[PDB]
Amino acid sequence: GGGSQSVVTQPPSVSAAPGQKVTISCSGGSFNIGNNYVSWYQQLPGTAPKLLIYDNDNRPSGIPDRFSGSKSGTSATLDITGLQTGDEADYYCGTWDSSLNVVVFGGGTKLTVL
């Protein structure tokens, strides 16, 4: 199809030059981000998605601290500082939705570094 709407919304794209800071937000509702825990994923081109953040702001062992997450209200945010060209990828937040009863993923944000 063409354009559409998502349960949890993210900007379609974000960009910044090497070294800068970038933020990607997810806006949801009470039944998903409002009451449940958010996680974030990095999907490198043609690559298996990988967990960046879990339970709103925790980092798994091999994830550098320039990646950070926070949650407020029905919104969640992923912060990436010291941007690097290798950071180019699609980013998704994820959360259980108590109404739809599925893990809902945000629409996705394509990060370009230039």
Place this chain on the structure above:
Amino acid sequence: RQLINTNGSWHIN
């Protein structure tokens, strides 16, 4: 934490 790992159960209700 408030959370408690279900040890492998996708859901409980």
Place this chain on the structure above:
Amino acid sequence: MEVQLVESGGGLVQPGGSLRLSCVASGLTFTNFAVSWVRQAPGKGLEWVSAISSSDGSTYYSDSVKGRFTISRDSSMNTLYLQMDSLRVEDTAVYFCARAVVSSDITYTYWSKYFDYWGQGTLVTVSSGSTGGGGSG
């Protein structure tokens, strides 16, 4: 030892047909984790599809695949499957196997479900070759 969640069984099929995907874990355990299949349609975002509990074998589905898909496991303890019947063009997507860490508060109302490891995924294309506009989906 290499760590792998390998999916396979992906392929081109006609609408109405069926396929069986399998996901094999190597170098990682399923003990104390649930497992899900997540797909990604052409140029779209990640969509949860189905899950199974390593604890009691309970099964769960998104409303869009219910009655058509069947998730299961066998005695190997490191292998699960996704039987896909009555396939529809919109079922076209790359299917990822992903290990789930699941937690909830004591009243089972607040939930934390995240995927800490994923496979490269297997591609499933459902079409007759006729679509009216570019690729299938």
